[PDB]
């Protein structure tokens, strides 16, 4: 997250760290949202590689013991059937991870609230992106969970020539684009928490940013619109 602030330890309990094994250690590569005690929602591009992944819930500082972490392996990876690794702009950047075991819920580990199917946020709706992603374009991962205030940019505006044009689809949510704050590598798969009727709900799954950089003016961070996949999500959980 570029231009963010350190999130309070108990602010976003549904946020998880998706890590892959590298040698005798683990490396954070993406974020995700715990949606069931044994299911995590993340971006499909986060699990394209043939890597061994693990999920960490109750995480805050990637480099120090917080005394709240739970580590669990990934049992099954269900990527959306229409996902195409070489066409992120086409959409369908979403995947569900069935965990090897069900995590314990507490102050630091909670299921993320998902919006009702079809829900679209009004322009400039209040949202926060969270994650351990790079703190600067081509920079390095944050040690502590970061959050950045990223108001939404409606589709009409986001799909205009000055912004993302045809690159953005109706199945996506745009947020930010102020040139200072944004998601960045390592935030992918993580949540976009938006305030609706007094309650924060995970409306987006971090998908992509401009190849020009992370925090680029009029190039808001783009997320898979969660409300467009409610049926898909339920279908997967019900049959897996
Ligand atoms: Ca830790």
UniProtKB/Swiss-Prot annotation:
It catalyses: Hydrolysis of proteins, including elastin. Preferential cleavage: Ala-|-Xaa. Its cofactor is Ca(2+). CDD domains: Tryp_SPc. GO terms for molecular function: metal ion binding; serine-type endopeptidase activity. Its EC number is 3.4.21.36. Ca(2+) binds at residues 59, 61, 64, 69. Keywords: Calcium, Disulfide bond, Hydrolase, Metal-binding, Protease, Secreted, Serine protease, Signal, Zymogen. PROSITE patterns: TRYPSIN_DOM, TRYPSIN_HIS, TRYPSIN_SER. Residues 1-238 form the Peptidase S1 domain. Disulfide bonds join 30-46, 127-194, 158-174, 184-214. Pancreas. Basal layers of the epidermis, hair follicle and sebaceous gland epithelia (at protein level). SUPFAM superfamilies: Trypsin-like serine proteases (SSF50494). Transmembrane segments: none annotated. Pfam families: Trypsin. The keyword Hydrolase applies. It is found in: Secreted. The active site is at 45 (charge relay system), 93 (charge relay system), 188 (charge relay system). Belongs to the peptidase S1 family. Elastase subfamily. Serine proteases that hydrolyze many proteins in addition to elastin. This is Chymotrypsin-like elastase family member 1. The lineage of its organism: Eukaryota, Metazoa, Chordata, Craniata, Vertebrata.
């Amino acid at each position: 997250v570029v231009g963010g602030t350190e999130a309070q330890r108990n602010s976003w309990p549904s946020q998880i760290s998706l890590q892959y094994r590298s040698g005798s250690s683990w490396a954070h590569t993406c974020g995700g949202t715990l949606i069931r005690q044994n299911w995590v929602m993340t971006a499909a591009h986060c699990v394209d590689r043939e890597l061994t992944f693990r999920v960490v819930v109750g995480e805050h500082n990637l480099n120090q013991n917080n005394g709240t972490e739970q580590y669990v392996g990934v049992q099954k990876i269900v990527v959306h059937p229409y996902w195409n690794t070489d066409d992120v702009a086409a959409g369908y950047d979403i995947a569900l991870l069935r965990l090897a075991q069900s995590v314990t819920l507490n102050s630091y580990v909670q299921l993320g609230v998902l919006p009702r199917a079809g829900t679209i946020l009004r322009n400039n709706s209040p949202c926060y992106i969270t994650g351990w992603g790079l703190t600067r374009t081509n920079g390095q991962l944050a040690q502590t969970l970061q959050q950045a205030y990223l108001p939404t940019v409606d589709y009409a505006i986001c799909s205009s020539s000055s912004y993302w044009g045809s690159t953005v689809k109706n199945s996506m949510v745009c947020a930010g684009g102020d040139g200072v704050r944004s998601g960045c590598q390592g935030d992918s798969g993580g949540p976009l928490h938006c305030l609706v009727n007094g309650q924060y709900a995970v409306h987006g799954v971090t998908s992509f940013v401009s190849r020009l950089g992370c925090n680029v003016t009029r190039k808001p961070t783009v997320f898979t619109r969660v409300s467009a996949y409610i049926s898909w999500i339920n279908n997967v959980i019900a049959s897996n």
